[PDB]
Every structure is written in structure tokens, then in C-alpha cells.
Design a protein around this ligand. Sequence first.
Ligand SMILES: CCCCCCCCCCCCCC
Ligand SMILES: CCCCCCCCCCCCCC
Ligand SMILES: CCCCCCC
Ligand SMILES: CCCCCCC
Ligand SMILES: [Mg+2]
Ligand SMILES: [Mg+2]
Lengths: 384, 384
Amino acid sequence: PNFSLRLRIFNLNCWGIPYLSKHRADRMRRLGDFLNQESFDLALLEEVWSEQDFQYLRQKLSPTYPAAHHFRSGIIGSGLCVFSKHPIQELTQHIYTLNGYPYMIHHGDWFSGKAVGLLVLHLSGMVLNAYVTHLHAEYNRQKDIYLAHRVAQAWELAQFIHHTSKKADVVLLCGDLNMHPEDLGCCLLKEWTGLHDAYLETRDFKGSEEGNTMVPKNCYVSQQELKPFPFGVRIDYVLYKAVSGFYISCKSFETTTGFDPHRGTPLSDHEALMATLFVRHSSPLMCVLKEAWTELGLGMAQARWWATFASYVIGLGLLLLALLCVLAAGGGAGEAAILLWTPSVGLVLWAGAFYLFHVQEVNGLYRAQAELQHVLGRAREAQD
Amino acid sequence: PNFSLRLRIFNLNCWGIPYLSKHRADRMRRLGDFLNQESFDLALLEEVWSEQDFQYLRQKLSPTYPAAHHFRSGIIGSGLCVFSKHPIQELTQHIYTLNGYPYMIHHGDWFSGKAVGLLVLHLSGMVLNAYVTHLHAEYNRQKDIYLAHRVAQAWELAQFIHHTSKKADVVLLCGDLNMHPEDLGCCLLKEWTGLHDAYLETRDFKGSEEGNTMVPKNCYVSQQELKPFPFGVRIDYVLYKAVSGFYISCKSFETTTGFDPHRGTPLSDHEALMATLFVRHSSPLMCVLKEAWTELGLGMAQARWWATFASYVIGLGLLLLALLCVLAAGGGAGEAAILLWTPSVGLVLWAGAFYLFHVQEVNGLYRAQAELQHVLGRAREAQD
Ligand SMILES: CCCCCCCCCCCCCC
Ligand SMILES: CCCCCCCCCCCCCC
Ligand SMILES: CCCCCCC
Ligand SMILES: CCCCCCC
Ligand SMILES: [Mg+2]
Ligand SMILES: [Mg+2]
């Protein structure tokens, strides 16, 4: 027969960080009211770190959205809340192996345990796979110590979607990639999976200039962060694809322009993305993959160097400990050898933890690089 | 037309641990010779921690097996080597979130970074998904602090297979589950996925009494470990299932009886599993799931208690540090306040790391429990 489906998709990074976000409770309340009024088919909230906030929203949005799930991983949680007016048939989560560095507390991404969540919804006889994700943040554009990490996360995300979506008719990904469209990670994910950006394909667009999710107008956003880019950055995306026999088109795409759609203070530092999708029945560029392979190799070399440096520190600490024992045994100093001894022990223990973390990082980088190399090799065989 | 496929599957836990395994190099050499002579379609080796050993085997088995992959995760690596006479179309890996405790060095499973690996092989127009896995070990049968961990790992393994095998005609899992057939984890995996044990369904069985992979006869196995069970334990399995339109039967299943099939010293402490599978064209028990849900909840409660205990220790250390400063400021003791100060600082740092690890563990336990609860709830809705 004729199949027509209308999908209302809402994506918002809620910036609900406890004790670090202004007016967090008020923003949650406004968001709940907005969602109830709109009645989106699927709403994919992000950065809701507080469990209480999820429970506040789940109870508030219960009649409109009977199905709600929160993905939890890492110390502070993944932060992914998903609300659906349709019952979720299946749930699964993939957690990225290389989420940053713990010593970089000022950044703090490592404690998040970032992940990608899969929701399977069967709508009108059509399998839909929905993915919500939050990639590692970018702190300095000019120099990135997380460039390799994000590329690996993008590759793991691409692999997860490719493997788990075999039978899904429509594949939807809504997430804060944290990368520009030009950036390698976005290209790698799109080229492999085959997903298409909603903003690029929308018949009608209403909202912030250039669809930029982070905007100077928004009060919460720091001006210094957006000083390089005058109109702000587009780092949140709605990506969609359909199998043969199914055609999906993006009728209307909308953003809220740096403010609450009720003229109130913005809901979050980021910007809401609202996409209307209509579903009607009826080769990866190896250069992109090779560039990713090269970047991962550079990252691995740096990780190996850090592990080697750490091993040297452990050795130095051990030599110092031996020297301290000699001095104590001789008794020539006659004092404070014990005092110096305890910190020296701690140095060795800490340098060992640093070394172990780096060895694990090299293994993590290798896993992504090896899979990329495998794909590249097969492509070369096909070419020849 | 008529489709007939013969599959020769070999599974062996190689026990190739560097500096902890007797005759490791000799055993690797014997294994390479055996594999070359046999020419198994797929060989799924396990516990090969050394990279050099993998390279030794890959070069040796290269003409017979053009395709070989090693999965690497964690500090010491996953240890999964797979050799295939057929080119591997796709590779992906899932690493279990809750692999044990690092403080339990005597056990040492945490450093392994255990994982499940997926190999996609297209054979004669038929998609085959092959999974190799190694679950957490069991140390005391009577009391398990890893009971909850293994159940969570089994659930994550079941979910991974279920989601990634949508399009696969034949699904094969060969791994060291480390659990008896009666145990909950095996039941949970089999009930969800639908996999069938080869030993149970084999037309002909040759080998050790009761198919027990770990045997008293084998010299390497410690007698104390097998003191409770007279004939040994069956903890390695070959599990297989096929989609409708495809029928798979296990013609011959074989084990090597505690020795090298050449009458030499055994290849490993464990036992080789050799299954011949013929493929010819043409509801989960909620009680098992509910039992798993209950066990995870008990584990979570223990983890929460440990985190609370750790927080108390951090507080005590801080109070001690404050007291030490007071004494130093007063100068009444006049000595050794600095000496005592440094260890007290270390206590706080270590108790904090312990606390963070436990908070992460609670989140990990929650992820498995929430998915199980979701499935149980849907089943109840169907029942009513
Ligand atoms: C996300 C994975 C992070 C794990 C970091 C590895 C650190 C190793 C610490 C080992 C502690 C040993 C205590 C006896
Ligand atoms: C497999 C995951 C293991 C991670 C263990 C978490 C330990 C947290 C340690 C934090 C270290 C902070 C250093 C400043
Ligand atoms: C995961 C432990 C890392 C500690 C690094 C201290 C420099
Ligand atoms: C991952 C760090 C755990 C340390 C525990 C020390 C008791
Ligand atoms: Mg943020
Ligand atoms: Mg072993």
C-alpha cells in the first residue's frame, strides 16, 4: 500500500550539570513544559547528569511520553536521556574506550564515561534505529590532544551503527559530535555509515544564522569560546538515512535562536534542534579512512612516548628509595631519611598508574587503527 | 538449489601467559604444527597474551590460514587470537564494562580487559557471525564476589550477539564462559540468544569423560582446583544457532583428553574443542531474567556500601590531616608532625580512588539491571 510517516525529532544538550549550571532547576521545568506541549515523537536529551533531573522529567512527561530511558556509564554517568511517545522495543549501549585523560581534571570528560545509545522502535511496520551520542569536547582548535581520541570515538560510533543497523529501515542519529562539518571525524562517520545531515537537506529552515547550535547571543555561552567564530559553531547534528524501498525527506528543520521559544532566558547554553521527517515507502572514500588511520598512528606514538617517560620516572623513584635506605642504614645523616622515604614511595606508585593508563591507551588506539587498516586493505584488493 | 557446508571449528584456551606458564614456547610450536595439519575452517584461540606468540603463530599458519586477527584491550590485552582459512569481511569488538577489581592482584582479571570479538565471514552465499569470548574467572565456588560481574558480562555478551546478528544466517560462539551449564550466566545467555550447545547435540562424541574441558589427568591443572569435582569442569563451550531456512547439525564433537593428540605433554591446562558442523539449507524464560535481575541488585547494594565506607575513610583522613596541622602550628609536640602528615595525605588520595572505582561499579551494575528490567516489563505487558 502507501506508507506515510511523520516524525518529530527534538535534540537538546541540556547542560544540566549540578552546581556548575545557572538556573538548572528552572531550565528543567521550562523544558518539561515545552516537551509536553509539543508532543515530539522522539526527544533525545543530552548532558542531564543528575538522576533527580531525569526523574523530574520522566514523571512530568509521563502521559505524553510513556517510554523513557537513561543511559548510565562512567563515574558521573553518560548523561543521555531519551523520551519517546512510542514503546521502545530494544535498548543497547556502547561505551567508547578512549574518553580522554583523568589527570586533566580542568577538562573532566574522562569521568563522564561517554557512550552511544540505541533505541529500537517499530513504527507502522517499519523498524527504526535511533542513536544518541555525546563525543569528547574540543578545548583548543589550534592544538588538540584529543584529536586522536575523537577520531577513534567517531570510528567506534560508525562501527556500532553499521553492525547493529543491518535490519533497520530508518536509521537516525542525534548527537553532540563536538566537531565541525569540515572536520575529519564527521566525515569519517558519514562516509562509512552513509548518514545524511538534516540541515543540509531541509526544505525549510528557521532559526539561528547558519544553523549554528552554539551562539554568541545566548547568555550562557562564554564569549571567549566563540571569539574565533563570529556566528558560533554547529556541533550538534541530526543525521538520518533510509534503506532501499524507503525514502526519507526533511520537511522542516528548526533551531531556537539562542533563546527560550517563549522569549525567556535560554533553555541551555546550546541550541534545540527540531526536525520533521517524512518517511514514505518508495562506497566509503578511502582517502578519508586513510587520513583517520594516519592521525591515530600519530596519537599512538605520543602515547608510547608518555609510557616510556613514565617508566623512566618509576626507575628514578626506585633508585631514590634505594639511596634513602643506604643513608638510613649508614646512619650518617642520622635524621629525616624516613621523612623523605614516604613521598618517594608515592612517586613510584603514581608514576606506575600513569604508565598503566598509557599502555592501555596504546592498545585502545591500536584497535581502531587495525580495523581501519583492514578496511583499507580490502578496498585495495578490490581496486586491484 | 541444495546448499551443503562443512565447518571445522577449533577452540583452545592456550594459557600462553608470559613467565607464568611452563613450556610456553614449546606448546605454541606444537599448536602451530597441529593447526597446519588439520586445516580447520576457523580456529579460535584464547589466552594468548603475548604479541610475539601471536606473530609466531600468524607467520607459521599463514599459508593455511590467510586471515588472522588479534583483539587488544586493557593493560595486558584481551588475549583473543582468531585464525581463519576464509577472508574476514568485518571485525568489531565489545569490551565488558565490569571486569573485576584491581586491588585483587592475586586474581588479576581486571588487567586483562576481557572482551567479545565478532568476525563476519561470507561463505558460499551465507553470512556467518563468529564470536570469541573469555569471561571472568571463578575462584571460590561457595562464595563469589564476581557472581554479579559474570552475570553482567553474560548479559552484555547476550545483548551484543542479539543486536549485531540480525542479518547473520549462522551464529557461532566459542568461548571460555568459566561457568557450569547449570549456572545462571550460561542459562541467561542461551535463553536470550537462542544458541545451542554442541556437546549436547553432537551425533558422535569422542574425548574426556563428560566433555569436561578442565581435567585432573592434565598435568598443568592444579589438583586443589579440581578437588571438588572428580571428573573436572566443563567451562569452554561451542554454541551455535541458525536462522529459518537453514539447518545446522553437529556431526562430530571431540576433545583431546588431557593430553597432546600426539601423546606429548598437553598443549594447555585446558582442553581443545573440535566441532564439525554441517549447515544445510532447509521466548526467553522471564524467570531466568528475573533471577539475573535479583543477583545484580544484590551486587549493587554491596558496591554502594563499599563506596560509603570509602567516603568515611576519606573523611577520617581529612580530620587527621587537620589535627596534624594544629599540632604543628601549636608546636607542642615540636617534632614529626610533618612525618605523619605525608602518609595521611596518601590515605586520602587512595581512599578517593577506591571510592571513585566503586561509584563507577554501581553505574555499571545499573546499566545491566535497567536493560533486564525493561525486558521483564515488556514481557509482563504481553502477558497481561
Ligand atoms: C577507563 C580505564 C581507566 C583505567 C586506568 C588504569 C589505571 C591503573 C591503576 C591500577 C591500580 C592498581 C592498584 C593496586
Ligand atoms: C575500567 C575502568 C577503571 C577506572 C577506575 C577509576 C579510578 C578513578 C581514578 C581517578 C584518578 C584521578 C587522578 C587525578
Ligand atoms: C588512572 C590513574 C592516572 C593517574 C595519573 C597521575 C599523574
Ligand atoms: C582503580 C584504583 C583503585 C585503587 C584501590 C586501592 C585500595
Ligand atoms: Mg557542555
Ligand atoms: Mg587460564
